[model samples]
Target: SFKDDNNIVALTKGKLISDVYTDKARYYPSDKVTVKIELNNELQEDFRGTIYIFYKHLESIVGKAKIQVNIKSGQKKQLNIFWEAPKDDFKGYLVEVYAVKGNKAIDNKNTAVDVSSDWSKFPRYGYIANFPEQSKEKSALIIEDLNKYHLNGLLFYDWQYKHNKPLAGTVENPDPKWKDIANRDIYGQTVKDYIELAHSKNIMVANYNLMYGGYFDYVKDGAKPEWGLYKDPNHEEQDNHPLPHTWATDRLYLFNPANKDWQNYIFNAEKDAFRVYNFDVWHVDTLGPRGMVYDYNGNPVELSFTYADFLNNAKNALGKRIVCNTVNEYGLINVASGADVDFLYVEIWPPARAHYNFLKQTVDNGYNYSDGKKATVVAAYMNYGIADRSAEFNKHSVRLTDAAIFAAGGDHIELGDTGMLSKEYFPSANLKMSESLVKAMRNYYDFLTAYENLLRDGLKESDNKIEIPGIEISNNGSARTVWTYAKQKDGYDVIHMINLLGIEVSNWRDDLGNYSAPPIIKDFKVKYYLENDNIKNVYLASPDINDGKVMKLQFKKKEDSKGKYLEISVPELQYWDMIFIKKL
Candidate 1:
């Protein structure tokens, strides 16, 4: 696999790093690898598409010699660089790249491309609400406060043409620039600024791009009629025969990816956003792509084929730098194909209402889609059980749901954006309860980020048996459902026992449920592997212990003929608390 002539190297900006890398292989990075850069680009304009590698020991930022290159298209190019890794082993390093031209800089930057370890953080508070009314300064202040509590990103509701009342496309020739700016303005500059500010504080920003919209009062103007997707048009048959689709709620407008114009429009629009604004990622929301209806002047073509084409355009336009939401079965295939997306992200709800089965199914489905490839699986942890405020019974339902998602071998945990700053939006009259919940959520989010690699490449269980042992175990998907596991980056083993079939306390579930075969706390043992001569420090992080207590875990060279098994006593777990051990 090693090519002597093609050994890694450093690159300089003015030397020209080939305009772009031709192959995807050159674009991806190996674990703990670095890309050293020598800056030579003029500072007159915003500089982008600049790739730089970071060595672990380089503390102070300094300027170095720039690298040179010549390029055509459709080719992969490696940079030449020289740097030394620290004496201590590293888990991963940040790869910063940007593309820029002219006085106006396209501030598109991609960070943390490759990780040697798993994340250990989870968001406590997420949002999908309204826009900030004032200018950049005011907005930044508001955002800074939100970030203090783990606010992920905002969902621009009415910025799109369809969300505005009476709609822009249906009226008598509304300004195209205005409509474009409406969508562009909020998403373009606002999101870019917000994301940069968020990232400065270690937060991520995502856009809520809608795919369903049809009832436009200004359609006769320049509005293209073919773009509208109609479901259940006449309301003649109730059950799925005449399939009713409308203009407002279930607008169902599917872009024909097969058509060149549609593809151009979608690609160009998305590119402008990426080129101009530099938002972190995108969330494509539709009425679930299960039965997506595409219309070309009232005729139909295959939905899946068109979708594939559209996704390819997105991939090309965004340059594999952004992530997209996969909420339906159709989206799953694109992720599996390794087209434009980098990871897996989905939203979850009740089985009858939003159907939670998809949570388990997504992991099982993604395994086949990824073909054992390393990709992140994120679930939009929804606040479904927070029904009527005062009762407060279903609070733990979402918590349990999140635990199950990790148990099913997923990577990331995402919380939906909901503006809870004002008490009018929350159940607690004073917002203290909301504050407490967000604090708890921040702890979970941090835990996940710290051990992210474990979630991505740790032990996985199929059916009732686990494929790997001595790490975090997730048993949330099992039918019997009495057991669960905690995954860690080190070979230290941890198990989480949750009672999912507990009683419902008003809106939340009571953790006081009786277990059929409560976790065999004393009988369980762990067998793990450790690299020889590497310094290791093992410790556990969980809420069940008495703050600072040395956990006495039994260790043996071998439990049976197979290998060594370390035995540890299991403590009583309350809802979603984790028991983690560190080996440095």
Candidate 2:
């Protein structure tokens, strides 16, 4: 293990600002790590220099490399240092970089890296609403933007023939006409071409199809009316219904999932779509909670078990393709555990709208229910209309919501082909972001990608092992404080602290104006329980500051009646901070 009090070093020459950081905070042994350096030249003349890279291993500087670089005047040049990890594992090491001109050192910086064996990969899922009308050139641009954030999969919203029948077209002419409904056509060729393009870039595409309900007219397109759901005698008027939410205007008749005929219909429809478009995943959806339904024969059906049966059959039929279902706030645990699905997914409803704790608890339940075999994905929309909230308030909402979700071990379903999300319904378009907001969003995305392993890989809740000493955040004048999440991976302990002090509202679905940015707090204390005495180092990193660089933190040992603990102090926290502790 290596330790350094002075982590970052910087110097100014005539008109150049040089900064360097590792592509990721930690890497596994034998993995490739990248060191990125940016040279911002503000002079009239060009710059020529030699950049040197050195690594400190166990109290000794054992490795060195050098390269030559040139930068145009008033231009920024970005470079990369590709370092291969050693064969053996180590706790942590230090990397030092130097920019020298004609034997004179101009600027330098140092950062720390952790090498561990416990790491895993996850899909970075995004969404895209408008595909049929998009040209090839436009599609390429959309994929390019999504790739910048390392997005791996996309939920293609409303790119179907209908809710009940998907890809109901021939290969040569795949467009489906639905002018009477949405006045739009499903461009089959465009969908196929986009999927192929996405595959070429190693991105997976999932078609968003309704799970249990469809418009009554779909029967004319192929569905059987006898398989449609009916209501009990007491509630005959509410038999066939349309969802009360947005984008659902046509009265839809629910299908009896217990009906083998309906199950076979959906399975075949999905199989046809997959065969035609070669989609990598299936995005199954449902409306909000529903009560018991009666089949044509007047037999009662349990919706949860019905959904599970369909999912299992679909998963079995669609071998090697991922199948994800939306719980719609009704059957989260049951659908997550009972079905052979890929992961747990939920679209936020009123029950989960109000408190950040509900967000954290939902994620925790998903993790526990799946027995660590899967992850949870949340699609909570932040309304961004001018009448909804100010741009500033939306920006703050995005930061706070994203931080809370990621900290709780859930993937955010905001970004898509339509751009960053502004509303919850279909055709979710991007909100106009100011330059500052753009930079902040980019920083957060990059930070998440760089440290994905620490934040998500094999993560498990460990709040019992760590606790913050003094901080209270509240919606009103009450005594609530900041939200703390304790997670652990093999050989490492992590704590995420999210600031919610000045926010006046508790629910994430409330108006953004109801939430206010809190004051930046400095010198906050954290108390962590350490069972092992061979801890190597503690570091704090946040996307809100310094480009998410890891800063070494000093700690003092303390003992009380309960047990021994490590007392660490965070220098400053604005929105969120992640603390990482490495143990031998």
lDDT of 1 by residue, 1-584 (tens): 11111112222222333221111001112322334222333334333333433221111222222232333333345554433322332232222233333222232111222222111222222443444334568657656545433333443333443421212332333323223213332333444465566655445455445432333332532335455443434322111112223323333334444566555555544444444444555545444454534454545445444544555566666663344455545566665675454455554333422433355567667666767553545444333333333332223444555554554456433333333322212212221224445444444443333233344445453221221334234343333233454444445434444434342222111222111222223334433432232323333333222211223344433344443333333444454333334444
Judge candidate 1 at residue 192 and give its lDDT.
Answer: 43
The digit string of per-residue lDDT tens for model 2 on 63-159 reads 7888888977889878888888777653445566666667566655544455554211344578777756557887776676665555657788877
N/CA/C clash count, model 2: 6
Report the C-alpha displacement of residue 100, candidate 1, in angstroms: 50
Query: What is the Å distance of residue 293 in model 1 from its true position?
Result: 3.8
CA error at residue 482 for candidate 1, angstroms: 3.4
TM-scores, in order shown?
Answer: 0.57, 0.81
Model 2 misplaced regions, further than 4 Å: 1-45, 50-67, 74-121, 132-135, 176-181, 233-249, 384-393, 463-470, 473-480
Among all windows of ten consecutive residues in candidate 2, which has the lowest summed lDDT? 1-10
